[PDB]
Amino acid sequence: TKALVNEARTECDRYVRESPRFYDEGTFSIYQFRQTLQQTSQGYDAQA
Amino acid sequence: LTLLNQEMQNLGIEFKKYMSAQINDVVIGNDREFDQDFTKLKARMVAR
């Protein structure tokens, strides 16, 4: 049980790192937040 | 006696958990009661 648990956790630690597929211009743009920051999100909240 | 203090230690750890959960809901508006009072505050000043 100990051996498998350690091995399983080790693999589970590799998903966190972002692969090249994680970023895609068409699928999603990180810069669309500017549209929510350019006089759009008035208060210091996370609702918009 | 060797087990009495273990419950005490978890009580301190658990106590902070509830306090952190309740306060977090206020910062984002999850606590619906707080929002109703807050909007009342804004309306009075603008009307005033």
Side-chain angles (χ1 to χ4, degrees):
Chain A
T1 308
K2 295 301 303 185
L4 300 179
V5 167
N6 166 260
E7 194 282 339
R9 178 172 298 97
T10 53
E11 294 185 349
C12 296
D13 193 11
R14 303 179 185 179
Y15 299 99
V16 301
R17 181 176 294 284
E18 63 183 8
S19 62
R21 290 170 287 92
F22 171 73
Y23 170 74
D24 181 7
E25 288 76 351
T27 306
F28 187 95
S29 62
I30 308 304
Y31 306 149
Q32 71 179 27
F33 301 154
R34 294 182 297 176
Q35 311 308 331
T36 71
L37 296 172
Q38 290 299 142
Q39 196 61 222
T40 302
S41 179
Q42 302 299 97
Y44 293 177
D45 57 357
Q47 184 60 34
Chain B
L1 280 292
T2 313
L3 180 149
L4 181 64
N5 52 7
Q6 286 188 344
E7 191 69 5
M8 299 280 287
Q9 296 181 230
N10 291 26
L11 184 63
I13 301 299
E14 192 279 343
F15 181 87
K16 296 182 294 184
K17 186 62 61 174
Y18 180 78
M19 183 57 59
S20 183
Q22 296 296 134
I23 187 64
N24 177 24
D25 293 1
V26 185
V27 176
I28 302 164
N30 188 268
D31 189 329
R32 190 63 55 185
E33 287 71 1
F34 187 86
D35 298 2
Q36 298 294 351
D37 298 328
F38 184 82
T39 181
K40 181 65 65 56
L41 174 63
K42 288 169 57 175
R44 184 189 300 177
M45 304 303 89
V46 178
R48 177 59 175 178

